[PDB]
Symmetry: C5
Subunit: 331 residues, 5 copies
């Protein structure tokens, strides 16, 4: 549903999401020499991989299938509290370190331009033995470049173990926030136009909309930085002075992303005061126009009114040009 699933016992596997469309399993098992890869929708087929001596990346898509999550969960010996965190998708990103596995929760965003609105999808990962278990809400992810790298043997991914695969997955995900930040920079640039130039009713709507989107963004990003901070200065089954430099590089991007997001909160928050000033000033002009038209034709209509002749007209042009050369000392 949404943020209530109340009075249920601790271990209860409920998908609180909204995507119940697809379901797919996808394995990739690889070594320095060779690699295999397949999709199935039968779970019992991927369970043997728990015991590979070679890296495997099991990617379960469509976790609305709580049955499936439970089965994989029990088989790999994952705590029910963890499985529950997998299936509840309104949640702090986070990392927890257990005996024989690392658990990570991350968000993966989408921004629709022009209908200025942003959705997220939760991704969970579990490193354990030679496996990276991945859990997703819906088909469509940012991990495609990583598949190619295993498939077409690019980079060093094939030489390296399962922890480096975790790295590689996290790095693909963090990098995507750069795409997202670029799109948001464009809305900001568009919006600081309308503000001091197209003053309007729907212009104020979009400002607030962006501010709101930024707050949501900040809410994910700051714990995301903490995730990567934790992965970097910590380290159990992450082959150490080996992969640690790589986590640190993602940690760095994380810090960059956080900084850029603060920068936007900052720029945007002033934006309304810029609009307020653009409009109060458009008021000032309307006022001046009213006031000069008023200030000449008020006495002129008065002296023409005291009745009850080209010397009246002449006084009417004298006190009319001493107005206009007084609104040459302001206006």
């Amino acid at each position: 549903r949404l943020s209530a699933k109340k009075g249920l016992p601790p271990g209860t596997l409920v998908y609180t999401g909204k995507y119940r469309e697809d379901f797919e399993i996808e394995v990739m098992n690889y070594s320095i020499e060779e690699f295999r890869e397949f999709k199935t929708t039968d779970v019992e087929s991927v369970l043997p991989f728990r015991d590979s001596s070679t890296p495997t990346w099991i990617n379960i898509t469509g976790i609305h299938r709580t049955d499936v999550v439970q089965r994989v969960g029990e088989f790999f010996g994952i705590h029910p509290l963890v499985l529950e965190d997998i299936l509840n998708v309104h949640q702090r990103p986070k990392v927890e370190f257990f005996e024989n596995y690392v658990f990570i929760v991350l968000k993966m965003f989408t921004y629709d331009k022009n209908l200025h609105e942003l959705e997220s999808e939760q991704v969970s990962l579990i490193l354990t033995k030679n496996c990276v278990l991945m859990f997703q809400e819906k088909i469509g992810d940012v991990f495609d470049p990583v598949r190619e790298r295993i498939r077409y043997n690019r980079g060093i991914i094939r030489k390296k173990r399962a922890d480096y695969l975790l790295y590689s997955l996290i790095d693909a995900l963090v990098d995507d926030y750069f795409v997202l930040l670029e799109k948001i920079d464009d809305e900001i640039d568009v919006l600081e136009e309308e503000v001091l130039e197209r003053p309007e009713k729907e212009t104020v709507q979009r400002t607030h909309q962006l501010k709101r989107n930024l707050v949501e963004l900040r809410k994910t990003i700051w714990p995301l930085r903490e995730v990567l901070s934790s992965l970097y200065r910590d380290v159990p089954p992450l082959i150490e002075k080996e992969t640690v430099p790589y986590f640190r590089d993602v940690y760095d991007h994380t810090i960059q992303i956080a900084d850029t997001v603060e920068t936007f909160r900052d720029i945007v928050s002033g934006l309304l005061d810029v609009y307020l000033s653009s409009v109060s000033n458009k008021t000032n002009e309307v006022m001046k126009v009213l006031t000069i038209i008023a200030t000449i034709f008020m006495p002129l209509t008065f002296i023409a009114g005291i009745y009850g002749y080209p010397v009246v007209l002449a006084v009417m042009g004298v006190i009319a040009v001493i107005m206009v050369v007084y609104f040459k000392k302001k206006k």
Copy 2:
């Protein structure tokens, strides 16, 4: 608000609340095999349970009955300073660890929609031997799902000891803040309508009212996070590498709740500036309308006035349509 109860000695048991309606004791004593449960209003009947070898949940409702709190207090060996903390309900949530008992104070909120106003109830808990003493201000709580779990033997609560009962009750209370958060989100959504759309006198009232409610909400939630932080990374008679994972899960929700509350403070604080801009932009129109009507009929009334003929009327139509085709360059 009874925020004063001054010049009384440290040990003094005064209920500073406002609920003096009901009174009830309710025991639930349980084990893996069987369970018993009853209500009474005679205190002497519950005191034997102090020495159970099996988990017990004594729940005393209506702590306006200071005499009752004193008796239970003294019998379980609870410090007078703690008993006074129980009866005084204007207070930081908190945890205090003593020799043979943990003491906890929490708040439990109620939001009345439409009459946009929020009340709270304090709940105190004392874990000690195999007991969870609970103290409440008035009938009606969030612990109902927990009773069913003991009654109908759901979950694992019956296999686990008194500390897990503590957990289970806190967990039930923390979860309720999610209900409350959802209701507040709705007011926020409703309010960012009226602000940029139904500009009004009572609209500004509700904004402030919400802001106020948010501040009160923040005041409780932040120390609440600290309560659950303390329970998690600490631990005396809380069967350790057993129940600790559970408190941690509540700790997490606490962090989520905190985060969500900052997000509302943030969104709402801007809401007045959104209103300001919605209104400064409106005034502008009333001004333009006044100014065009002014600016044509000011000189037209003047030249018609300098007379005190269809060539006058013709000049009056020429300088009237050169106005209207100049407010086609703005307005």
Copy 3:
């Protein structure tokens, strides 16, 4: 008053106060069995008490008598730097722990309602041997309930030693901040009326006045929290696992008072923006009234003016009622 007392040597006893009215000494010496109490204005009479084996509370009122403070100071062996801190009354509250005495400086406030203005008095205390030396600026304090408790043997104060007397004195003073907070809450409640309802010139005065008063209040309360924090987690001649729980209870109120004060800063800071919005929105009405009256009687006065007949009056009523049934589509 006052505030500079420059280029004087370190040890210099100047009263920088403003109260030079009264002077009084008042002793209360007590034990489990019996108690004595008296007032004097002769100092040499109180000095023997330094060597009681029983708790004594010497209360010197009117420290403008720097001579007296010096005498008592030297006799109990109190550092001249401390005596100077006693007599200088613009000053962070604080605690300083010396060899054979604790020194404490606190403020004690008065809020005059209706003439919305707040004064304070400084109170100093020195625990040393079996004495609590108290120093005050002017007659009238909050310690009256404490006298009663010694006099009429209430509570446990008579069983306990001098440190518990210090506690009692501090506890009485902190509790008075509750009184003061309640009075401030009332001004806030009254002020958030005038803001969105009686918009006015003197209304803005009171807001600022209150904000100012709150800043002054925050300035004292935050270091007050630090005083009590320090007394609680520290402890020399404070009979330990005895009186510590009691300091801890004051510590708790201190935190509550701090929290409440932040809450007011928060609430009040928005209050001007509420007024701004209440006025920017009214201006609107005054504008519309001007604009309707303007917009009908501008052209009506023009056509009646083109003349220098019940078909003129009929056109004047037709275009007058097509206005009013157009301000039935707004206004």
Copy 4:
């Protein structure tokens, strides 16, 4: 001027603005006797380096970089320190070297009525039995300290050179109280003009004061850190001797910081108070326009339809007093 770029680390440039005067001034003293003189020949003060009795060498006019160099080398002061002496745009600070303490402070001047504040840097070096002092321009706050050595007041003559350093820092810190007093006056004057004399130059002074307060805070906060460091640290500062004295300056330092925060806070609101005073006058100016408008608009119209007589005047007084008794329902 704070550019002096691409010069090697050791470069002695005076980046100040005061090149007027130059003077040396020694005061050497002991418990028994004291000598003091002025010179402008440096070689005369260098012998003092080896006193067994406290000396206070005060060099005024450090635009004389040659002099600073000579004293520097002779006392064995690192060129990096010497450069910090001559560069006057700089965080106040304390640096502890092998055989000396180095301290940099600011010393302010506020000119009332031309609401503007200048500073002068003071450096100090404690080393052996010397306190070297370096100033930009004649005129300092140290006069009371000279008298105390001259006229053997206080205890300065009994105590060593570290107590002299204290005495000098204490004199300088105290001066900030003078400066804070003067600033409190501007604040009190300004919160008049804001809600009472609304004006163009009123807004100027607000900003000006805000700016002054930011510069002030910039110096005061590191100043607190200087004194914090001197207090809880201590090498050649005769310990449980002079430590109490540094601590007392430390306290003033904290009081000064707290008072400055109080002003930042008070003043920051001050513009919103002005905004509200004006948006409201707007309201009044509006009402006045609107009543005058609303009666004399129709009255000028009916007198205009011609083209009756004390029956028109009577209708003109009726619809004129039904206005005024309608602006008895608002206004």
Copy 5:
């Protein structure tokens, strides 16, 4: 030119910059005795210098030449992750310490006055053995004074080793921020003119522009302080109690720069509210002018209108001077 370079393996050397114009290498190898210096565009010629026993400063300009960076990188044994950080030009400044080298990334700014806009260039440094490798985007730097010092044997740079050269290069770069800060102080001084004096549409543009520039500036300066904080209290191959005092001096400038940047954020952020008030008040005055002209010539045009004689004119002068001596009680 973006910040997306997505789905590429960790080690990938892409120049994400925008300057592809020049390319140059420039070595300076020096010792106490003598020095050599040359430019080349052939890389293989500089590689031998890796093994100098004497300090060398290799400065590669035009890192768009990724091939060159790769070659120097591998030969000096620099990790591909660092190389990638060299070529990626959008990036937290930072320091990373590896086995046999220190890596540092810094920015180097340019402010164009009058077209109020600021660009930056990245500079990377690697201290390794007796080399400082420097990497730049485009010809033109701040390091010229440092070349002179080696060339014309000034300062102590020739006596000192490679770590002092690093210091010298970082010190040159940090110093330039003072130039940049001076230029920005000028815009602020100019802008707080236009705000309270030349109120205008393009005046608000520049304010925002400057705020934006400040935020970007702050983004670089803060991690910059962290860079130099890290170099100072850390230290591997930086000859310790030797060069550390020097890094500390840069550290200090860094702190100063940060403090100055906060000061500007602070000053500038209020600048819009100053403009708002300067304009709302130009509203207030325009209003008063309209309202006095209105308020006299409204009734005067009415009584001259009631028809249908020097006693009419006399009443018209009486009620015209009782207005003007009523706008001597306000206005």
